[PDB]
Amino acid sequence: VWGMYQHADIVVKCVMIGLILASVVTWAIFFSKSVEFFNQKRRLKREQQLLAEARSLNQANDIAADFGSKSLSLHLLNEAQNELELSEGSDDNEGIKERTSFRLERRVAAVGRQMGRGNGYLATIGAISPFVGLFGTVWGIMNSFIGIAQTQTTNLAVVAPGIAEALLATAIGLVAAIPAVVIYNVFARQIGGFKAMLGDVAAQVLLLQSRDLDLEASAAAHP
Amino acid sequence: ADIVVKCVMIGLILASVVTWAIFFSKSVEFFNQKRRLKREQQLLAEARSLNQANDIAADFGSKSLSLHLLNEAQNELELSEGSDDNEGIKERTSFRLERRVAAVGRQMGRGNGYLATIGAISPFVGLFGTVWGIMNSFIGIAQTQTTNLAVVAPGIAEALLATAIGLVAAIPAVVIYNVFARQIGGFKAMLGDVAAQVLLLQSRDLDLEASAAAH
Amino acid sequence: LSVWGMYQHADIVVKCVMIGLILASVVTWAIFFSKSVEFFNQKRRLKREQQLLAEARSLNQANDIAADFGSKSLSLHLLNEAQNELELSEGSDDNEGIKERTSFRLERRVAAVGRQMGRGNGYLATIGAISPFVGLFGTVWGIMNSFIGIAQTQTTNLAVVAPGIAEALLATAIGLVAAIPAVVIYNVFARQIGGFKAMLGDVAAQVLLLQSRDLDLEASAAAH
Amino acid sequence: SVWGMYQHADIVVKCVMIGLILASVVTWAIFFSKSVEFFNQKRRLKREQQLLAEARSLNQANDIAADFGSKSLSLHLLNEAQNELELSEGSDDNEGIKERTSFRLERRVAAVGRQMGRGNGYLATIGAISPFVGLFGTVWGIMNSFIGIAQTQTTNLAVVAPGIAEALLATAIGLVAAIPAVVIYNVFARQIGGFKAMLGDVAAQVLLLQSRDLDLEASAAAHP
Amino acid sequence: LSVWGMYQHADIVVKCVMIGLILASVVTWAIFFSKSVEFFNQKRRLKREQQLLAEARSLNQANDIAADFGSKSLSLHLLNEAQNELELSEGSDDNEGIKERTSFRLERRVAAVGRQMGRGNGYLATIGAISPFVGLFGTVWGIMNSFIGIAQTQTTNLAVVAPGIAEALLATAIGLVAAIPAVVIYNVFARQIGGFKAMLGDVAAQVLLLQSRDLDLEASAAAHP
Amino acid sequence: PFIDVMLVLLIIFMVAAPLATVD
Ligand SMILES: [Hg+2]
Ligand SMILES: [Hg+2]
Ligand SMILES: [Hg+2]
Ligand SMILES: [Hg+2]
Ligand SMILES: [Hg+2]
């Protein structure tokens, strides 16, 4: 209760408000990054299914023509094409391919690091919440022994408020701790899988570019 | 008694039910696919070419994994028709196969997350149950005037059962998780071996053919 | 009191926790001893074979030094694997090719050997994982039996609570004796398996070097 | 009384409390010093990357990066690439130049990391043993309490509540010293990770420019 | 009684936990001191060798600068390994090969030296992880025999059992006193061994760079005489 | 850093179980 929980201490009330705030942060993160993640994943799976039919790189640029300016696959395809324009006139294809991959994979890596922004918060909250709770309980039963030292009435109605605030400290510690760690683990799984899917679309682009460079260089030799 | 403790315990029991459902269904999956892959590898051990491999695996079944790898190598050979660079084909083929295996790996471990978290957080959700209980009891002794804990002892025991159930729900989840990790390990190993065979056969044939048309 | 008494003196649940944890300790130490003598053997003999192959200026000299090693020897398996990739590739003009396929095979074998060495690590890892939970379940059973004692006797004395708490602390003590050695032994086996996989990798590197050097010297030697 | 609580403890628990307070002091000093240093260096690097993203060549990059002052990292990377082009003057194999440049630049980035993590070991260790030092405070304290109840007989009236309260204050301070160390260390790992990532992107830009320019130069002089 | 008597007056199991934990602390300090003298000598020796070889610019000059670094010197061993790969490869026309074969050699020794530096780190890590838990076993066994004691006769009046609880908590105390120094020593050994592996890696990279540059400049210089 | 939860909870029951009696 508002009068019950506010009764008899400062520090323990502060660990209580801190841990409940931590739970709020975990759940706010949860909803916002949830809608973001579902949207972007839906879009990406659509784009990969569409690009699976491109027999070349030009066909890919046509399938991705309308994908949108903020789309990722248009960013990868644009990176490959821009590496073809900057390398215009080079006799070494074995090089071009290299320069493209280095670009593309790093883009993916960067997006990976852009996915894990804020996951540090969930990790830390789930990490220290049982320890902050544990400090709450140790402070509580410490206040209990202080209580039996003042009045010297020994047991058992004097120890009770201290034991109460201690078990409340552990309870709040677990309620903040568990959802944070579970959500963090699902974010590890999903960030892994999404980073992988992005890797798959990038790999499609790299393959198309390499194959076309080989067919072009080999096509004007013998014929 | 109370409310929260019973919901926590029924939650733990539901978690135990999910543990056993995963146990049975994943058991059937891993055994079937592991058997199919073992057979397919023993059969492909007869391959002296890439064409002989595409032939041994023609009827392996449409959902076969080895037919998917072999079909990927062959498809990379067909899409590259007219290329003079054999060092190219090899690369692209490896890259393709290297995705395949990973994807299949990621699809076998789709469910282990549930077992892992259930076995990890089950004792702690149980502990929350009992701590809420004993907190309600000592809150009880802080009203009126009391002493002689024998009055609140049953409530506290009832609380300790929540942790008991938490641990009992946790144990099968943890053992099952470890066994499924081992099996996925062996499976990723086998799938990797079949992919490695396809890559070798392709590389060797492209080398012997390319060296034969240099003379 | 003493041990056997402490067993026959206790509940049925703590009886099952004691028998379970005692069994888990037994398997932990058995694994330790058999895999310890085995690992000592494998490292000793492998180090011997590496010393012999260290004199090899040529891959043929390696196959000759390794002629009589053992039917199950690891170095003979690596040299035989290189030989098999040279034979399957016979007549190829791309040596850069052969080298690739050879390394690819050799450095897979090592990894596979690792997974066979860790064929037993699953048990130790799992025992160390569940032993504290089984012990903790035992102790919670103890303290619960204590509060039942204070519920019957309506006493609150120390001697009605004593049996339950003593049983709980028993569950904890045996819980630690089963839990700790599983974890240290598991980590020591990870450390030793790492060193073994590394050593085998070094022999593989010797084979790969000899092959690459010889192929280069042959391809360069006939030109002229 | 806080002064009385303290005066109730022991000389060992006193070392535990003053020790934990000192450790908390050093963690906060580290936080402020390396924090200002790191923000400065990060903002500088972000500025430089934003500038160098527009360079269509390597001469254009060396020109845009003119200064940038001195101690800047991008000028150090560009200078390493330049030094490898100058040492290789007269080499016809461009595959070589390229290779060598990456080997240096990559490795340089790693060194920067090792200079960023110098001193973070302190935070890791303090956050590692702080709960253990507090726990030692409490167990030593409560041990003194039980010895106290041992030499005086009948029961213990109020005598050591405060001793026990002070032990529990030892664990409380132990956790209060431990937690900020661990959180600070984790933010430093995350930020250092992102830093190595940005520096890695600049190094990669230099590498790309070098490769593209050497290829276009070799191709333009491979036909008139 | 006092601490010494409290040791001599405790149970046999708890006596063994305490003596064991002091032994672990002894091993902790012996390891600390010997590895300390070793790592400081070798680290600043290597720092010198790196500073000298930074001027090599040749790999003939590297062998010459390192001509006397000592028969146990690490840079002399790496330079000799590259040279030995040049001598065994005499007559190879493929440089792309030599470089490869050279690198594979060098990067193989560094790791090995690294793995020899971390020999014994298992003890520090294991002692720092286990010692509080083995101590915890000591006290839990102690208070367990105590509570077996209070339900025998069966007693009350807590002041009669207090010596047992004291002599048990001593075991956790000793466990922590052995545990903490192990953890600190292990952490500095991890970081310092890291820096050493890095420095050795820097010298090896110098060797590889010099060798590559020589092979390129020789091959290109005798291509257009 | 992990068992410390279990350690301190077991300790707190060894502190609270004597807090139980008598008086
Ligand atoms: Hg507050
Ligand atoms: Hg319900
Ligand atoms: Hg039984
Ligand atoms: Hg101290
Ligand atoms: Hg002993």
Q: Which residues of E111-140 are buried (b: 16+ CB within 10 A; e: fewer)?
A: eebbeebeeebbbbbbbbbbbbbbbbbbbb
Whose atoms come closest to the Cα of D137: which ligand? 4
Greatest CA separation for chain E:
105
CB D126 within 8 A of CB D181: yes
Q: Which residues, 6 or more positions from A171, have their beta carbon under 8 angstroms from its beta carbon?
A: A133, B128, B131, B132, B135
CB neighbourhood size of C140 (10 A)? 24
CB E70 within 8 A of CB C174: no
* CA atoms of B168 and B170, how far apart (whole Å): 5
* Record: contact E157-D152, CB cut-off 8 A: no
Torsion of CA D170, D172, D174, D177, to 10 degrees: -130
Whose atoms come closest to the Cα of A19: which ligand? 1
Residues of F in contact with C165 (CB under 8 A): 17
Helices within chain C (DSSP H only): 3-8, 13-53, 59-65, 74-88, 95-117, 121-152, 158-221
Q: Residue D93 carries which side chain, given as an amino acid letter?
A: D
Q: Residue E122 carries which side chain, given as an amino acid letter?
A: G
CB D72 within 8 A of CB D44: yes
Residues of D in contact with E205 (CB under 8 A): 103-104, 107
Q: Residue C107 carries which side chain, given as an amino acid letter?
A: E
Whose atoms come closest to the Cα of C13: which ligand? 3
* Record: contact B113-A156, CB cut-off 8 A: no
> How far is C157 from chain F, CA to nearest CA, in Å?
7
Q: How many angstroms separate the alpha carbon of residue C37 from the centre of ligand 2?
A: 55
* Record: contact A134-F4, CB cut-off 8 A: yes
The answer, yes or no, to whether A and E have at least 3 beta-carbon pairs within 8 Å is no
Asked, as a colleague might, if the bond just before F23 is cis with ω within 30 of 0, I would say yes
Q: How many angstroms separate the alpha carbon of residue F7 from the centre of ligand 1?
A: 27
Q: Which two tokens mark D144?
A: 């003194």
CB C162 within 8 A of CB B155: no
At CA E139, angle to CA C22 and CA E158, rounded to 5?
120
Q: Which is nearest to B129 in space by CA: B5, B214, B1?
A: B5
In whole angstroms, how far apart are CA A47 and each of A53, A105, A198, D117? 11, 18, 10, 41
* CA atoms of C42 and D36, how far apart (whole Å): 54
CB A216 within 8 A of CB B79: no
Q: Which residues of C153-175 are buried (b: 16+ CB within 10 A; e: fewer)?
A: eebbbbbbbbbbbbbbbbbbbbb
CB neighbourhood size of D28 (10 A)? 13
Q: Which two tokens mark B148?
A: 């002689």
Greatest CA separation for chain D:
109
Chains in touch with B (3+ beta-carbon pairs under 8 Å) read A, C, F
Reduce the DSSP state of residue D103 to 3 states and report it: helix
Reduce the DSSP state of residue E86 to 3 states and report it: helix
Q: How many angstroms separate the alpha carbon of residue C186 from the centre of ligand 5?
A: 24
In whole angstroms, how far apart are CA E162 and each of A33, D166, E150, F15? 56, 19, 11, 13
Nearest to E216 among D88, D149, D152 (CB): D88
* Record: contact E212-D96, CB cut-off 8 A: yes
In whole angstroms, how far apart are CA B29 and each of B68, B71, B116, E29, E119? 18, 23, 19, 53, 43
At CA A204, angle to CA A200 and CA A205, rounded to 5?
120
Residues of D in contact with E170 (CB under 8 A): 143
CB B137 within 8 A of CB B155: yes
Torsion of CA E180, E181, E184, E189, to 10 degrees: -140
Helices within chain D (DSSP H only): 2-7, 11-52, 58-64, 73-87, 94-116, 120-151, 162-220
User: Which residue of C lies nearest to B157 if distances are taken between CA atoms?
Assistant: C144
Class of residue D71 by CB neighbours under 10 A (exposed 0-12, middle 13-18, buried 19+): exposed
* CA atoms of B45 and B39, how far apart (whole Å): 10
CB neighbourhood size of A190 (10 A)? 17
* Record: contact F8-D128, CB cut-off 8 A: no
Q: How many angstroms separate the alpha carbon of residue E27 from the centre of ligand 5?
A: 16
> How far is F20 from chain A, CA to nearest CA, in Å?
7
* CA atoms of E120 and C220, how far apart (whole Å): 47
> How far is E122 from chain F, CA to nearest CA, in Å?
19
* Record: contact A138-D187, CB cut-off 8 A: no
* CA atoms of E154 and C166, how far apart (whole Å): 14
Question: Quick one: CA dihedral D99, A88, A94, A61, positive or negative?
Answer: positive
Q: Residue E220 carries which side chain, given as an amino acid letter?
A: S
Reduce the DSSP state of residue B13 to 3 states and report it: helix
* CA atoms of A205 and E69, how far apart (whole Å): 52
* Record: contact E122-C217, CB cut-off 8 A: no
Q: Which residues, 6 or more positions from E86, have their beta carbon under 8 angstroms from its beta carbon?
A: E98, E102, E211
CB A148 within 8 A of CB D163: no
Q: Number of C-alpha atoms within 13 angstroms, CB side, residue D33? A: 10
Q: How many angstroms separate the alpha carbon of residue C19 from the centre of ligand 3?
A: 7
Q: Residues 94-153, chain E: which have Cβ within 8 Å of F?
A: 133, 136, 143
Q: Residue B30 carries which side chain, given as an amino acid letter?
A: F
Residues of B in contact with A177 (CB under 8 A): 124
Reduce the DSSP state of residue B215 to 3 states and report it: coil
User: Which residue of D lies nearest to A137 if distances are taken between CA atoms?
Assistant: D172
Q: How many angstroms separate the alpha carbon of residue C180 from the centre of ligand 4?
A: 27
> How far is B95 from chain A, CA to nearest CA, in Å?
8
Helices within F1-23 (DSSP H only): 3-20
Q: What is the DSSP letter of B151?
A: G
User: Which residue of E lies nearest to C210 if distances are taken between CA atoms?
Assistant: E101
Give residues after which chain D gaps, C-N over 2.5 angstroms: none
* CA atoms of D159 and D146, how far apart (whole Å): 11
Reduce the DSSP state of residue B155 to 3 states and report it: helix
**Interface list for chain A against chain D, based on CB atoms closer than 8 Å:** 86-87, 89-92, 95, 98-99, 102-103, 106, 109-110, 113, 120, 123-124, 127-128, 131-132, 134-135, 138-139, 141-142, 145-146, 148-149, 152, 154
At CA C175, angle to CA C170 and CA C178, rounded to 5?
130
Q: Which is nearest to C177 in space by CA: C26, C14, C15?
A: C26
Q: Number of C-alpha atoms within 13 angstroms, CB side, residue E6? A: 22
Residue D19 forms contact with F (CB below 8 Å): no
Q: How many angstroms separate the alpha carbon of residue A122 from the centre of ligand 1?
A: 21
> How far is F3 from chain A, CA to nearest CA, in Å?
11
> Which residues have CB atoms below 5 A from the ion given as ligand 5?
E 16, 19
Nearest to B84 among A193, A203, A221 (CB): A221
Q: Which two tokens mark E203?
A: 């010298």
CB A167 within 8 A of CB F20: no
Q: Residue A222 carries which side chain, given as an amino acid letter?
A: H
Question: Quick one: CA dihedral C62, C65, C71, C74, positive or negative?
Answer: negative
* CA atoms of A137 and A131, how far apart (whole Å): 10
Q: How many angstroms separate the alpha carbon of residue A12 from the centre of ligand 1?
A: 8
Q: How many angstroms separate the alpha carbon of residue A16 from the centre of ligand 1?
A: 8
Q: How many angstroms separate the alpha carbon of residue C159 from the centre of ligand 3?
A: 26
Angle (deg, nearest 10), helices D162-220 and D120-151 = 170
> Where do we find the tokens 């080997």?
D103
* CA atoms of B175 and C129, how far apart (whole Å): 9
Reduce the DSSP state of residue E57 to 3 states and report it: coil
> How far is E131 from chain C, CA to nearest CA, in Å?
10
Question: Quick one: CA dihedral D200, D202, D207, D212, positive or negative?
Answer: positive
Residues of B in contact with C112 (CB under 8 A): 189
Q: Which two tokens mark C118?
A: 């860790």
Nearest to B211 among C91, C133, C144 (CB): C91
Q: Residue B8 carries which side chain, given as an amino acid letter?
A: V
> How far is C71 from chain B, CA to nearest CA, in Å?
22
* CA atoms of E223 and E130, how far apart (whole Å): 65
Resolution of the determined structure in angstroms stands at 3.5
Size of interface A-B (CB pairs under 8 A): 95
* CA atoms of D113 and A133, how far apart (whole Å): 35
Q: Which is nearest to E135 in space by CA: E177, E189, E165, E171?
A: E171
* CA atoms of A76 and A107, how far apart (whole Å): 8
Give how far the C-alpha of residue B65 lies from the chain's centroid of Cα atoms, to the nearest Å: 17
Q: How many angstroms separate the alpha carbon of residue D7 from the centre of ligand 1?
A: 28
Q: Residue A30 carries which side chain, given as an amino acid letter?
A: F
Q: How many angstroms separate the alpha carbon of residue D14 from the centre of ligand 4?
A: 8
Q: Residue D71 carries which side chain, given as an amino acid letter?
A: K
Residues of C in contact with E101 (CB under 8 A): 209, 212-213
User: Which residue of E lies nearest to C185 if distances are taken between CA atoms?
Assistant: E126
Nearest to B178 among C88, C129, C143 (CB): C129
In whole angstroms, how far apart are CA B112 and each of B37, B116, B166? 21, 6, 19
Experimental method: X-ray
Nearest to F5 among A134, A155, A166 (CB): A134
CB A209 within 8 A of CB A57: yes
Residues of B in contact with F20 (CB under 8 A): 149
Q: Number of C-alpha atoms within 13 angstroms, CB side, residue C200? A: 24
